[PDB]
Amino acid sequence: LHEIPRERPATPLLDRASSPAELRRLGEADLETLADELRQYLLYTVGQTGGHFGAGLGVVELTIALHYVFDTPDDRLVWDVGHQAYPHKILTERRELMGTLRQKNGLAAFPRRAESEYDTFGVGHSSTSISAALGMAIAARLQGKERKSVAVIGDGALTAGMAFEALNHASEVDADMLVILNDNDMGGPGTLFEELGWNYIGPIDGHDLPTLVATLRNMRDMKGPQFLHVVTKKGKGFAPAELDPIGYHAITKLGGPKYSSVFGQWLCDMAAQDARLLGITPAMKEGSDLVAFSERYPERYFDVAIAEQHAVTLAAGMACEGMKPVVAIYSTFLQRAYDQLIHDVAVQHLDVLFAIDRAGLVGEDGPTHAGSFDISYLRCIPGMLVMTPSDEDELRKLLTTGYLFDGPAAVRYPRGSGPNHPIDPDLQPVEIGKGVVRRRGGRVALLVFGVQLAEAMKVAESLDATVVDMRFVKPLDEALVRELAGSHELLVTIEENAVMGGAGSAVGEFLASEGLEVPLLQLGLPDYYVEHAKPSEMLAECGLDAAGIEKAVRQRLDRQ
Amino acid sequence: TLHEIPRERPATPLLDRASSPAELRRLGEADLETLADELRQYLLYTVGQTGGHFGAGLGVVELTIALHYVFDTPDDRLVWDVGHQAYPHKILTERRELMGTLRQKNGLAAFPRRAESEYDTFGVGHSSTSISAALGMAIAARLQGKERKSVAVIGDGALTAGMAFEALNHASEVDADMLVILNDNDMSIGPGTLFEELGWNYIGPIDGHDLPTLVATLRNMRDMKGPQFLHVVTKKGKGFAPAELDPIGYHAITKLEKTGGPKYSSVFGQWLCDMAAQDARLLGITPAMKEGSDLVAFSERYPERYFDVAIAEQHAVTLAAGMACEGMKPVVAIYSTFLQRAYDQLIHDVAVQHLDVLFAIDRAGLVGEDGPTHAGSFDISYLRCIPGMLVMTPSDEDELRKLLTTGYLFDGPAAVRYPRGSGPNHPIDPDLQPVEIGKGVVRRRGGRVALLVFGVQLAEAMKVAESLDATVVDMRFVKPLDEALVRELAGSHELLVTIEENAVMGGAGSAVGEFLASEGLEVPLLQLGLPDYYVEHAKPSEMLAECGLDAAGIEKAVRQRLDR
Numbered sequence A: 001l002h003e004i005p006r007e008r009p010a011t012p013l014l015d016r017a018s019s020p021a022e023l024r025r026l027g028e029a030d031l032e033t034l035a036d037e038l039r040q041y042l043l044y045t046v047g048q049t050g051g052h053f054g055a056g057l058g059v060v061e062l063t064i065a066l067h068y069v070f071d072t073p074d075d076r077l078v079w080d081v082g083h084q085a086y087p088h089k090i091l092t093e094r095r096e097l098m099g100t101l102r103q104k105n106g107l108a109a110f111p112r113r114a115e116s117e118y119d120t121f122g123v124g125h126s127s128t129s130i131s132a133a134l135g136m137a138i139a140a141r142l143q144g145k146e147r148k149s150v151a152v153i154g155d156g157a158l159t160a161g162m163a164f165e166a167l168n169h170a171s172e173v174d175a176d177m178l179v180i181l182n183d184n185d186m187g188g189p190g191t192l193f194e195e196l197g198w199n200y201i202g203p204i205d206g207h208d209l210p211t212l213v214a215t216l217r218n219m220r221d222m223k224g225p226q227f228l229h230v231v232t233k234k235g236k237g238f239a240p241a242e243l244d245p246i247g248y249h250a251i252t253k254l255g256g257p258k259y260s261s262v263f264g265q266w267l268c269d270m271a272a273q274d275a276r277l278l279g280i281t282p283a284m285k286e287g288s289d290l291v292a293f294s295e296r297y298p299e300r301y302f303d304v305a306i307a308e309q310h311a312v313t314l315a316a317g318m319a320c321e322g323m324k325p326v327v328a329i330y331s332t333f334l335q336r337a338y339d340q341l342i343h344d345v346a347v348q349h350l351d352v353l354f355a356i357d358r359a360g361l362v363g364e365d366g367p368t369h370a371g372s373f374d375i376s377y378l379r380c381i382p383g384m385l386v387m388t389p390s391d392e393d394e395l396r397k398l399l400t401t402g403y404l405f406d407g408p409a410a411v412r413y414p415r416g417s418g419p420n421h422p423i424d425p426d427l428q429p430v431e432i433g434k435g436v437v438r439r440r441g442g443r444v445a446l447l448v449f450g451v452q453l454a455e456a457m458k459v460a461e462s463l464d465a466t467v468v469d470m471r472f473v474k475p476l477d478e479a480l481v482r483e484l485a486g487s488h489e490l491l492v493t494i495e496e497n498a499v500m501g502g503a504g505s506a507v508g509e510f511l512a513s514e515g516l517e518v519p520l521l522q523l524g525l526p527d528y529y530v531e532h533a534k535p536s537e538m539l540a541e542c543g544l545d546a547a548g549i550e551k552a553v554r555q556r557l558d559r560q
Numbered sequence B: 001t002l003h004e005i006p007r008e009r010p011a012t013p014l015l016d017r018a019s020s021p022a023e024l025r026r027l028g029e030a031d032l033e034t035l036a037d038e039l040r041q042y043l044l045y046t047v048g049q050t051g052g053h054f055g056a057g058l059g060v061v062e063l064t065i066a067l068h069y070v071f072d073t074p075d076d077r078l079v080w081d082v083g084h085q086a087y088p089h090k091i092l093t094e095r096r097e098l099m100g101t102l103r104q105k106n107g108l109a110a111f112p113r114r115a116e117s118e119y120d121t122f123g124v125g126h127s128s129t130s131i132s133a134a135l136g137m138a139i140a141a142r143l144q145g146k147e148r149k150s151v152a153v154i155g156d157g158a159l160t161a162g163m164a165f166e167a168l169n170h171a172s173e174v175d176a177d178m179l180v181i182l183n184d185n186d187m188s189i190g191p192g193t194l195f196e197e198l199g200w201n202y203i204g205p206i207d208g209h210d211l212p213t214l215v216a217t218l219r220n221m222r223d224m225k226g227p228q229f230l231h232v233v234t235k236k237g238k239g240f241a242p243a244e245l246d247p248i249g250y251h252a253i254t255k256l257e258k259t260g261g262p263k264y265s266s267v268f269g270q271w272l273c274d275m276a277a278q279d280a281r282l283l284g285i286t287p288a289m290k291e292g293s294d295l296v297a298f299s300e301r302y303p304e305r306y307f308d309v310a311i312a313e314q315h316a317v318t319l320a321a322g323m324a325c326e327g328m329k330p331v332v333a334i335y336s337t338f339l340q341r342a343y344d345q346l347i348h349d350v351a352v353q354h355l356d357v358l359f360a361i362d363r364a365g366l367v368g369e370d371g372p373t374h375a376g377s378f379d380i381s382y383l384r385c386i387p388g389m390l391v392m393t394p395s396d397e398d399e400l401r402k403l404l405t406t407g408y409l410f411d412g413p414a415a416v417r418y419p420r421g422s423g424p425n426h427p428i429d430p431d432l433q434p435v436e437i438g439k440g441v442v443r444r445r446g447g448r449v450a451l452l453v454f455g456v457q458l459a460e461a462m463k464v465a466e467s468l469d470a471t472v473v474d475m476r477f478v479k480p481l482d483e484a485l486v487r488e489l490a491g492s493h494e495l496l497v498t499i500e501e502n503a504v505m506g507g508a509g510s511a512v513g514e515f516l517a518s519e520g521l522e523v524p525l526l527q528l529g530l531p532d533y534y535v536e537h538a539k540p541s542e543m544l545a546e547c548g549l550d551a552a553g554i555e556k557a558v559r560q561r562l563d564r
């Protein structure tokens, strides 16, 4: 197919495969035609809603084979990451709900246990599928159940350390489970997995349904750790995607620069000025936007695969020799290198900059990818310099400030673009520990840590509030907070991070320790997992738009 | 091979001539076997004097000599994994006559440490970091045009961690010029197929105690290019027969030549056996810490429900998550400092899904001579900001058992944190019964000052409270917090004091701060806890005093605040 349908294709057989037992009723002769229907409805429905695209086109036949040959949902099927799982959803009672994909109150971006009994594990972060399936298998065995346990994992996901840990452990307990390797990013692998204790079969053609069905059949009942190697084509069945798998990894349905592009430009600009700079990403070159950097400074660019943990200790090692590494990494994925950041960087006070993207609410990918916690989990770590730029110009300057600082520094910023203010093309740092009064008013002061500043300024128009662009969580601008506490009736902290442990709480700690008893209102993300929606809707829910902030401030003021 | 530890200093005229590697490299190969025996004698003596790690260093006496003999250290970079085997390395790097200060306040640290010496390229303690660190130094040196060598020594156990696999793959990708030495002491003297497949030139296994083979092999490999993997085989406790015979007992020892209560970890382990006796669903998981966390008895009684995942904290937690999906009841036994490494798995695979998994967090707080690399300083801070977590802090043995029962019965993610060591030895109710969630326990009614204690500083706080006539609350829960008790005390007292063995920043005391601020309660608030720096190693009692967490420290802080 060469152009995505705009009208609901006719799929009479797929309308008979609404669920795995219904599908299993059909005969193998129909499976190939079913795959044409499925592929077609998928291209259609993702045209309607936008979403992940090329990877699910790659697993159409594999997903049909899997539900054909296995007794789902009693047989446990774990999809790694989940971006490839739209065919799975279409085949598990959610075909007609696909119109809701990634809309508020609609189907989630990934498999989700609460969404369907056919989803055994909520995924999004990669590489968790083997560990989870092994755990389900260890339990089924003790329970004397006879269910099967299958993980479909891609070749990128397999570069992650936890996947190695799971494969080793599965061998240790001689677990009866199947790992299917959906190899698409394409010489001689079998002996490796055999050395790890896994029975290796393959590689087989992942769009050759009769061979998939038969091979799956023989392996369904084999015992112990089984490893099937399947090969697929990303975007299979859609030429524009087969030829551009990067750009068709996700499609939007039929302003200023992105913060990540501001970072990428700062990265090239500093590299041109300082040969010490090294750029590190764990398999997120496009998203963190190291693209130009990687083309212009190839010998100083490191893609460590999906190995967040090694990315960080690697950088500690580089800094030991006087190089200046910059680890580009999303807030949600830095969760996975927390120990390397604490033990290998911060404990040694090594000179490493973390450029933390996707900080705050990330929109439709939902809570598995939210950057809700990095202020809280980093600021309790001694030695960290922790920064929250408010716009594009501030991101450029605080990156420069952290880079030049001799020690560990973190700069957090959101997905998407900003208020599109002017960016100074100089590369100069700003004073560490100092906020910027953006607005002198009275009565109530808004202490903003990050990109809600523009909403705070709108609120302060009507309330004539003081507004501060705090810039630093740690070290906090203690002298400004102390003056503001002595001259206002209310301090209001604002952040796109958990309130619990977050930046407002550092203000709170500082007020308590000096016995300053001024009222404090902490605005931030609440203590729950925010359901997927447009970014603007998640922020409105969390009260971090101008109307939410104004309502909270006015209420607190009316109560004292 | 010896059988007794020397009580006075051995005669080591050749080791006395090898006070640094440069001096060592001026000796001849024919001297090295005698140096090896003198080093071993010295090692036995000085660890007998100070206490410290023992058997693993015995295992690397010959390898350490060979390494500093063949490599141009400190210019050539040597990274020791974990570092508990690195006493022979310190003895040879200008520190021999300092080993009397080992693991003492202001003495040598437990592990290699960059600030301690130019011969330590990387601070270690946690495991499996050496290959990543050495690869980064190899990459940097090459971009700088330096011709220096990069060497990582890693034990067979550390190679079970995922980050070691991630580093072995990436080193292959960049075709790095480095040497990984696998110090394998679970084998005795096929075997390299794994490393060969990951792009590494594999050599061995060789005899890690044959200095002539070690020196010649190392010399050949020093000069080869690309990712080089040398497989060496050593014996636990080599050359000291009691440690060869009992390498668990001789992993570490006390200085040569009072009853107390049971260790918190042993209370935990008893709880685990008792609850497994009653609930066939309970499964116990440890990431290679059976002795430390103390699943020994449980492993023997319930072996089909005991899982040691090796040094694989990350997989430990996701494996629990998958177990909980089939209705089983995993308990992850994991140190606070090591749980740092599975944080993404706890957040994304457990909390986000609200799966019923219990975390028994040992080594909460300061851990003593092992130092800041192992400190359990942050787990209240990094867990309480996570939606869905039930976060508990028992004050003594009976409270620890009660709060393990409470977190288990809870259907959802729950955490119970307790320190190394033993407690104040209060009686322990043999029942298995919970307590109510989110409710503290008033231990003393006084006036003016209320001490809100999260954890095991309660006995010291009681001493202060008796001196001041203060109120004392055993809070039990950081999340959900006993908001009603806190509200009441904030109205009836002039000062609230929180005490916890965790970073003040983001800590349980800050949860009290947040609550007061959100309700507009304006009572003065003094937060006592761990300060914003890495506390240098010392006895636990000395580290607590430094931080203000003994009764003297608490009282001085409180009195000082009351004087304004």
Ligand SMILES: Cc1ncc(Cc2cccc(CCO)c2)c(N)n1
Residues within 6 Å of the ligand: A081, A083, A124, A125, A126, A127, A156, A282, A283, A284, A306, A333, A336
């Ligand atoms: C732990 C973890 N780290 C990073 C990602 C993002 C990612 C990078 C590369 C490939 C993929 C697969 C499809 O995109 C995902 C993740 N999902 N989980």
Ligand SMILES: Cc1ncc(Cc2cccc(CCO)c2)c(N)n1
Residues within 6 Å of the ligand: B082, B084, B125, B126, B127, B128, B157, B287, B288, B289, B311, B338, B341
């Ligand atoms: C990440 C990490 N996890 C656990 C340990 C504790 C440990 C378990 C097994 C073997 C060893 C080696 C010597 O004891 C240490 C650690 N050091 N680092």
Ligand SMILES: [Mg+2]
Residues within 6 Å of the ligand: A154, A155, A156, A157, A182, A184, A185
């Ligand atoms: Mg892939």
Ligand SMILES: [Mg+2]
Residues within 6 Å of the ligand: B155, B156, B157, B183, B184, B185, B186
């Ligand atoms: Mg070992």
Ligand SMILES: [Mg+2]
Residues within 6 Å of the ligand: B248, B249, B250, B251, B252, B253, B254
């Ligand atoms: Mg011992």
Ligand code: NA
Residues within 6 Å of the ligand: A393, A394
């Ligand atoms: Na600016």
Ligand code: NA
Residues within 6 Å of the ligand: A320, A321, B120, B121
């Ligand atoms: Na160095």
